[PDB]
Amino acid sequence: GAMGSMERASLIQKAKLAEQAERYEDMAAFMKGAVEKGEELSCEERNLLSVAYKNVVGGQRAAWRVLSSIEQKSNEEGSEEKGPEVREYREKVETELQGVCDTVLGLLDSHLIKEAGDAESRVFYLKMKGDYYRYLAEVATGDDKKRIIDSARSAYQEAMDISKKEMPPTNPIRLGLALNFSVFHYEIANSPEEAISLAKTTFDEAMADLHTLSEDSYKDSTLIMQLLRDNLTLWT
Amino acid sequence: GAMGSMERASLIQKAKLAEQAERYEDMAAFMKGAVEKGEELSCEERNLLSVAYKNVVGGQRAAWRVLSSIEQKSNEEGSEEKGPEVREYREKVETELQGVCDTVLGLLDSHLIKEAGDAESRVFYLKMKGDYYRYLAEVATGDDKKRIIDSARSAYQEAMDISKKEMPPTNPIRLGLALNFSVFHYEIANSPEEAISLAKTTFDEAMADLHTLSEDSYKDSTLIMQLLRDNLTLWT
Amino acid sequence: FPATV
Amino acid sequence: FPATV
Ligand SMILES: *CCC(=O)Nc1cccc(-c2csc(C(=N)N)c2)c1
Ligand SMILES: *CCC(=O)Nc1cccc(-c2csc(C(=N)N)c2)c1
Ligand SMILES: [Mg+2]
Ligand SMILES: [Mg+2]
Numbered sequence: 001g002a003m004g005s006m007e008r009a010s011l012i013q014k015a016k017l018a019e020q021a022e023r024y025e026d027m028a029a030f031m032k033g034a035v036e037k038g039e040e041l042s043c044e045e046r047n048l049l050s051v052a053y054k055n056v057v058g059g060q061r062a063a064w065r066v067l068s069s070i071e072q073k074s075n076e077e078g079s080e081e082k083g084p085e086v087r088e089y090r091e092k093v094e095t096e097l098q099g100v101c102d103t104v105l106g107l108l109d110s111h112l113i114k115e116a117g118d119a120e121s122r123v124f125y126l127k128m129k130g131d132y133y134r135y136l137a138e139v140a141t142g143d144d145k146k147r148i149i150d151s152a153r154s155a156y157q158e159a160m161d162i163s164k165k166e167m168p169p170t171n172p173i174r175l176g177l178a179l180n181f182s183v184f185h186y187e188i189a190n191s192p193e194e195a196i197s198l199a200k201t202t203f204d205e206a207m208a209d210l211h212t213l214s215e216d217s218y219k220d221s222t223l224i225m226q227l228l229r230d231n232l233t234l235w236t
Numbered sequence: 237g238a239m240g241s242m243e244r245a246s247l248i249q250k251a252k253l254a255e256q257a258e259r260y261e262d263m264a265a266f267m268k269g270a271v272e273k274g275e276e277l278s279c280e281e282r283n284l285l286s287v288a289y290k291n292v293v294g295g296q297r298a299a300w301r302v303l304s305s306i307e308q309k310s311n312e313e314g315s316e317e318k319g320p321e322v323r324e325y326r327e328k329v330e331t332e333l334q335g336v337c338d339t340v341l342g343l344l345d346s347h348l349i350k351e352a353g354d355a356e357s358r359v360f361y362l363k364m365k366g367d368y369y370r371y372l373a374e375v376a377t378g379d380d381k382k383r384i385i386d387s388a389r390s391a392y393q394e395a396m397d398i399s400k401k402e403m404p405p406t407n408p409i410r411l412g413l414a415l416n417f418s419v420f421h422y423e424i425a426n427s428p429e430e431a432i433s434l435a436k437t438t439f440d441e442a443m444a445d446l447h448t449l450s451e452d453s454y455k456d457s458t459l460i461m462q463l464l465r466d467n468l469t470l471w472t
Numbered sequence: 473f474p475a476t477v
Numbered sequence: 478f479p480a481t482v
């Protein structure tokens with residue numbers, strides 16, 4: 001690891017600077033170095049890790065979709081042959097995306113998840129595991145597409161079980177987990193009815209628990225509840 | 237060169253796909269590979285090259301400025317010591333920026349400029365040479381800061397001399413060259429009066445030649461003239 | 473695309 | 478910053 005010689009605290013400080021500079025690849029490399037120091041992550045540190053990789057993979061996903069759309073158009077009737085270049089470059093981006101997903105899943109498996117005992121950390125990492133299997137699922141087409149989908153489902157399910165037992169319905173981690181699992185159902189598992197049911201039930205149970213919250217907690221929860229509502233509006 | 241095995245035409249096709257996917261680092265690598273095939277570049281190809289590296293270095297510059305501002309704030313009176321991390325990371329970004337500038341200047345010197353005989357190509361590449369020396373100047377502080385500034389000035393000057401002899405005052409390359417040389421005067425050479433004079437004279441001479449243009453050429457020239465006016469408004 | 477966090 | 482192209 002190229003970050004092996006830098007102090008954990010310096011890696012975290014630089015992750016924060018990289019975020020401020022919108023240098024998300026750097027931010028991710030710094031956080032990977034911090035994880036590899038072997039200590040558990042604080043809540044702030046977990047969010048630095050997720051913010052970094054979400055931005056990196058998010059750009060890769062956006063590029064993959066652009067290229068995939070061009071590729072599909074070139075494979076319609078009446079399209080002029082352009083050669084292998086569109087497929088090759090789509091494959092290049094896809095391979096880089098899969099590499100990032102494998103890196104994140106590797107950190108979670110060595111050894112973030114197994115050391116996470118508190119609900120807030122364990123649910124956070126299992127949600128991440130679901131998310132990065134979902135990104136692999138978005139590009140998968142071969143003999144392991146079903147296994148990738150089930151790996152995503154399994155991670156999300158375990159996170160949901162813990163979150164329902166150990167967190168209030170308004171907890172932002174629990175809310176974001178449900179939002180994303182609902183999208184998994186809609187976009188990956190071809191289960192739009194499960195997607196809609198989950199989003200609705202999550203929204204309504206959070207609504208009923210908002211009265212217990214401070215003004216700052218209320219803002220955090222209602223922000224994610226609005227995303228649930230936005231998706232429901234898109235889907236109904 | 238990792239692009240040595242790919243066809244020139246495939247590199248150009250992939251540069252165009254990378255642009256569409258907003259993958260500017262890839263776009264730049266593809267164009268570098270195309271330049272290194274050794275053939276001259278068409279006008280479209282020259283613009284693919286400049287678009288790619290402008291986006292890459294533009295992001296580096298934006299990050300450098302964020303980090304430089306944080307660094308300067310940490311060096312004020314009453315600021316708590318944070319250690320070497322801010323300087324180190326600013327230096328990391330700076331070194332990557334200088335590397336990109338050196339790569340572009342290397343392509344221009346081996347051998348784009350020496351083979352460029354038409355005004356449109358020679359002015360384009362000399363403007364690029366000025367631009368990338370200007371980006372080096374923005375971060376320079378040592379014994380060669382003055383030499384970097386003069387290298388920028390010299391390139392811009394030769395481009396200006398050719399453009400004035402060989403191109404109409406409304407030519408978009410001539411206009412963008414003048415826009416950027418004017419910024420060089422204002423921001424790099426501490427010559428705001430020269431910056432303002434150049435921008436004004438360029439704008440007025442283009443204004444007087446717009447009558448000779450088609451509707452499409454008129455739109456291209458007036459777009460850059462508005463940037464000259466925007467700068468004049470900022471500076472007066 | 474739908475919203476995720 | 479001022480405009481460049
Ligand atoms: C779980 C507790 C928690 O969220 N605590 C915490 C403390 C300080 C900063 C953060 C945070 C969330 S996102 C973020 C960032 N993008 N830098 C930092 C969280
Ligand atoms: C100098 C002649 C010229 O501009 N010709 C030309 C032909 C086709 C496409 C371009 C062009 C300009 S910017 C661009 C891009 N960002 N892909 C392509 C120019
Ligand atoms: Mg130690
Ligand atoms: Mg593949």
Ligand SMILES: [Mg+2]
Pocket residue numbers: none
């Ligand atoms: Mg249920």
Ligand SMILES: [Mg+2]
Pocket residue numbers: none
């Ligand atoms: Mg050949």
Ligand SMILES: [Mg+2]
Pocket residue numbers: 327330331
């Ligand atoms: Mg330096």
Ligand SMILES: [Mg+2]
Pocket residue numbers: none
């Ligand atoms: Mg003059």
